[PDB]
């Protein structure tokens, strides 16, 4: 149970921390847990029926299975934190699955996937945030004409509806955010916020807090 | 509390899941979580009262602050898992951080898959996060050229595992986590061939289990 409140100052805290960079809070740790572990059921029941290219075997089409598992690409940096905790319940839920990471930065591709055989095989795209859509676009499009998988899906931590540009709907969302600049668990302000177990909304202008190139 | 015990067929059980990749538990989820959250208070206590070169009012010298934070490098992809745990303990101990990663592989010869993004680490505490220390030849090779390309004020090392029978070269990192045995180590982490990663326990690996997935990804 978490214990939520302002305190003289006007600032929110959450279990004696304060949080003077916060307009509101929009999810407690157990909440956003309790959303990861959901979806992880609902990937795991959606792809452990699934077949793909056998490539352990050589040929033809086998079940997802350690030998063939699911491929996961994960964004870095904003999904990283995201991507440890649903990996550990995809675990809890059975699913066959193996992970690799690809870097975008504000677009610029910084690094590539080392995979190298997806042809033929079921992907998982692991997203922060789905807001205007620019980003997956991107992302989706690289992946799909580089790699030629057999399904290309997206589980994303969190979607703004209310942010979209270009049409983008993720095919998993754990949780729904106001249409608001949201920091904490992954989500920062020039790498700032990131580590918070929390989901606020940022007080106005503070984007500018911390204007030094790191 | 964990229940470890072993099946009908002597494979390993840790909370009603069976293992059978596995040799032994080394440590339970438990016993692991504890000993990151440890080693984040003696990173925070270490750390907290130290000064470096200040970077946001572009002055001299300033605290480590959410202004100027420590600067951490997480090592992928043995790293990630055990680096989103330590950052939410070092949060929970108040100490300012980022986080960059660089990526390494060897051919043994080392090379760089990725290199960080960071560009001001001049003058700068670093502390570079791994999954494990055990020939050090990794560590050598990432500590040589973090030193020489970013010229860091102070540059320490934190792992998760240290496997002290397996050094080939001089490494004792500044913070370790856990100690394994000279063995093959899976999960929380470690793997084979990308398997096993998301254990939430450390296991040693049964020896004819290392090439079960001879396939590249
Ligand atoms: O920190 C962040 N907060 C957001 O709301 C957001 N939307 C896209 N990318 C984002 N990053
Ligand atoms: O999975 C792993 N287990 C180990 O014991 C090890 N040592 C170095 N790198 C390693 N990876």
Redo the contacts between chains.
Sequence with gaps: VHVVSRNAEGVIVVDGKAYPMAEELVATESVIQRSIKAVAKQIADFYRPLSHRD??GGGGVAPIS??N?L?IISV??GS??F???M??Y??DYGLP?????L?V?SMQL??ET????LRGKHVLILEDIVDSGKTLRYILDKVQREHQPATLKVCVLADKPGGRRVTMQPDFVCLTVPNKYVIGYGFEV???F????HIFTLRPGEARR?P???
């Design positions: 490539t352990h350690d030998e598992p491929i870095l940096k990283y934190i991507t440890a905790d990996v550990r995809l675990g699955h193996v992970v690799d990471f870097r930065a910084l690094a080392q995979f190298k055989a020039n790498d700032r990131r580590c918070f177990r911390y030094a190139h790191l």
